[model samples]
Target: DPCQKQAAEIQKCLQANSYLESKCQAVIQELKKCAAQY
Candidate 1:
């Protein structure tokens, strides 16, 4: 549902070093991917 929205921005955050997304759904993916960086 909402998670599918703005996935491109999420992907962008995943690629960026600063990692920032204002949307809720987008932030979720970013959080998931960012943690995997460890």
Candidate 2:
């Protein structure tokens, strides 16, 4: 399964902050953690 909530949060942050990766670092990290676990 995908990191659904983290991915969604990351997308939301990306849109809210003009697509800045830095703005979604936490969500990205959470996604990574989820991916690593799976």
Candidate 3:
């Protein structure tokens, strides 16, 4: 998974933000963008 880093970042962000998807939106989008590359 080339986007693993971004995915991990989203996980961390979500965890830090109490699992709030809104708070991790940036990292989530980053993962999406990364996924699009491959």
Per-model RMSD to reference: 8.6, 1.2, 1.0
TM-score (C-alpha) between model 3 and the true structure: 0.86
State the C-alpha lDDT per candidate: 0.55, 0.88, 0.87
Q: How well is each residue in 1-38 modelled by candidate 2, as lDDT tens digits?
A: 66887888889999999999997898898999999997
Per-model TM-score, in order, reads 0.35, 0.77, 0.86
**What stretches of model 1 exceed 4 Å from their correct place?**
1-23
The model with the greatest TM-score is 3
Clash pairs, candidate 1, are: none
Question: How far does residue 32 in candidate 2 sit from its true spot (Å)?
Answer: 0.2
- Score candidate 1 by lDDT: 0.55
**What ordering of candidates by lDDT runs from best to worst?**
2, 3, 1
Q: What lDDT does candidate 2 reach at residue 29?
A: 86
Best by lDDT, which number?
Answer: 2
Which regions of candidate 3 are displaced past 4 Å? none
Residues 1-38, candidate 1: write the lDDT tens digits. Answer: 33444465566665673554443455765556655653
